[PDB]
Amino acid sequence: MIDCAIIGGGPAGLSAGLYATRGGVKNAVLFEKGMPGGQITGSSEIENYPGVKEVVSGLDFMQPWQEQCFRFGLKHEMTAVQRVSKKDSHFVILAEDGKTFEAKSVIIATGGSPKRTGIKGESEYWGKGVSTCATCDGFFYKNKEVAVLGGGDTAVEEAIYLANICKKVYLIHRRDGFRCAPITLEHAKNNDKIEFLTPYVVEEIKGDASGVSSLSIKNTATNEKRELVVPGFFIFVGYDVNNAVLKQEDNSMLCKCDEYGSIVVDFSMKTNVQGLFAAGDIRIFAPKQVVCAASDGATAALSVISYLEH
Amino acid sequence: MIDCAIIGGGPAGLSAGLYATRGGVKNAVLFEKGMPGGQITGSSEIENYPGVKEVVSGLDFMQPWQEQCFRFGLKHEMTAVQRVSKKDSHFVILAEDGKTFEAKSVIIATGGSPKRTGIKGESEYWGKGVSTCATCDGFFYKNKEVAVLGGGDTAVEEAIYLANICKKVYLIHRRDGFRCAPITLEHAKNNDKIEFLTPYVVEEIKGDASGVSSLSIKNTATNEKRELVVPGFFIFVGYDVNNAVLKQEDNSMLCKCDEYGSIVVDFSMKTNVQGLFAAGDIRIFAPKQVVCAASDGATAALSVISYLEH
């Protein structure tokens, strides 16, 4: 049977595969729904991966990871994992196609995905100024005006953050009431560089050949229209954790998760289940950066190696 | 004063500076003795940094980090830090050149130092067949024979690890008795791929342009001498974290450490002191890999950015 089944082929899974195989795990299999690379492949530019000086698309950035991470014997399974279950002292991995695989250890590296809106222009201008990552794209908007969409803790927190780099932030939300904490809302209300626009919806994300130039926004109450001229639009309308593979037949979870469905791990990337590790955006307190996911993968693989020895 | 003082210019501090400055921290200063790059610059070959496909020396690997991590206004302070103290709501950084710097936040990224033996040849072949990292360099000796030096938990655990990758491991120690846990000794003693050489000292590490080629050893009980022909020599005679900057004039420590002196951090790289963070090999449970240190630095910088907001 498989020594280590790595579920998900983004940076976490790829790094775990590199480390596991280069560390002497002879039968490691990377399960991935499509082409690996993960979320970054949807980005037009990455420039903050330490040690990679060239600015290139997310797709181009991930291209060399394929040869490198497979250089030491990693195997691929191009399949959609439906479930991971514990059976005695091993794991049973059910694929969506009906196939079952057995593994001694498992690394869950399935990531997650920022939620999208379907606002007109969102796809066309995705990655030219429509962003779902202030850390990735905030720096370009230094001394400029930006808009943030959402009314949760993430929206309001990233609004406060962008308020420290940008000239002005327009915080757009469809209700007068906010889901975020009162304390953080208070901070945002006291920040003079944040203009609250509520209750508003964004009807169109407008741009050039190049990209985002303005937002066509509407006051849902008065129907008054306004064009917000901003080259940066940050969307924070929630985040989907890809934890579906943890759900058992009886609806229980394979391992402990937090209230949001993120996998609880320790500093060794161990879950509360022997032989089961997690890595990347799927785990608690993930910073949501490629280098952080890659580090998790390496850590989880190192733990797998020790586990398989013992 | 400085918004964030980063203490150490290895991958953790460099990644911290990149993220801090790209995240809008206006006055971030990296303190480093000599030139950034850290421990990996002692290695003749790194190939396990995810996303960097080329096989190059540590020095060459780190060279692109200089321009990249300083691209966004990071400042460089070319001096060793003697001490970090907390004073009211800030930090006082006493440098060895006698200057004092004030900072609103600090990231400790000072790493650590494998203990060296001073054996003839050690300096010359360091990183060229002499290694203190089995995960780093073990794969090169797959199906070959290697030697391990030491008698503690690290040496014996790494001998067991290497015996799963290499053809044979010679475990060399200067006494018949070992400091490692009893069960670890038992496993090693009964592993057919480990040959114990005790009580022995290594008199010389010999080699050529290609690297290590043999060890001259001596049996201190019987005084007889032997040449071990091995291309790989792993040294595990202890390790010291670089926590000297935490030591206060009154002999207290700036922040909580574990029993070995590694800085306690949470998943956000926060210490028990407000405004003080730590990253890389200095912190508890550090896996001791470049990617892991870089991730810690990124994480600490994001925590710094949040901290400086309020």
Ligand SMILES: Cc1cc2nc3c(=O)[nH]c(=O)nc-3n(C[C@H](O)[C@H](O)[C@H](O)COP(=O)(O)OP(=O)(O)OC[C@H]3O[C@@H](n4cnc5c(N)ncnc54)[C@H](O)[C@@H]3O)c2cc1C
């Ligand atoms: C648009 C965008 C821009 C970004 N910009 C940056 C940036 O500039 N810098 C940076 O550091 N980070 C950036 N990020 C964040 C970074 O991409 C993520 O933090 C990182 O990809 C997380 O890696 P991961 O391996 O944990 O998960 P993911 O990248 O989400 O990879 C998970 C993989 O598992 C696969 N999978 C999931 N479920 C299954 C299943 N059941 N069976 C089989 N396969 C499955 C998925 O197909 C996916 O390929 C960006 C993210 C996005 C979306």
Ligand SMILES: Cc1cc2nc3c(=O)[nH]c(=O)nc-3n(C[C@H](O)[C@H](O)[C@H](O)COP(=O)(O)OP(=O)(O)OC[C@H]3O[C@@H](n4cnc5c(N)ncnc54)[C@H](O)[C@@H]3O)c2cc1C
């Ligand atoms: C022989 C060898 C081979 C290795 N091979 C690999 C490998 O193949 N792959 C891999 O991923 N990892 C490898 N590593 C491990 C890797 O080098 C470390 O894990 C990593 O460099 C840790 O980064 P860091 O920034 O935490 O610490 P360090 O790299 O130790 O950097 C800390 C920096 O802070 C500076 N500093 C310390 N004290 C002060 C002070 N008081 N004031 C100012 N500056 C200070 C130090 O001089 C140093 O430059 C190897 C290590 C060794 C020894």
Ligand SMILES: NC(=O)c1ccc[n+]([C@@H]2O[C@H](COP(=O)([O-])OP(=O)(O)OC[C@H]3O[C@@H](n4cnc5c(N)ncnc54)[C@H](OP(=O)(O)O)[C@@H]3O)[C@@H](O)[C@H]2O)c1
């Ligand atoms: N450090 C912290 O304390 C911290 C930080 C970040 C996140 N969190 C946690 O994570 C959760 C927060 O999630 P998070 O903000 O990503 O999202 P989350 O709370 O779901 O909030 C999503 C927000 O986006 C709005 N929204 C959703 N879909 C939209 C759409 N299609 N168009 C326009 N607006 C839309 C929602 O509006 P409505 O309100 O009208 O439904 C809501 O205001 C909370 O439980 C919080 O505890 C905590």
Ligand SMILES: NC(=O)c1ccc[n+]([C@@H]2O[C@H](COP(=O)([O-])OP(=O)(O)OC[C@H]3O[C@@H](n4cnc5c(N)ncnc54)[C@H](OP(=O)(O)O)[C@@H]3O)[C@@H](O)[C@H]2O)c1
């Ligand atoms: N899984 C675990 O629980 C685990 C794993 C690793 C480490 N640890 C702990 O971490 C700490 C560090 O231990 P670690 O083994 O790195 O080192 P540590 O116990 O100091 O052991 C060092 C070993 O190196 C030998 N040595 C020192 N200098 C030498 C020299 N110049 N030439 C030849 N031999 C030399 C010592 O010999 P002598 O014995 O003759 O002095 C000793 O056997 C220990 O407390 C250890 O138990 C725990």
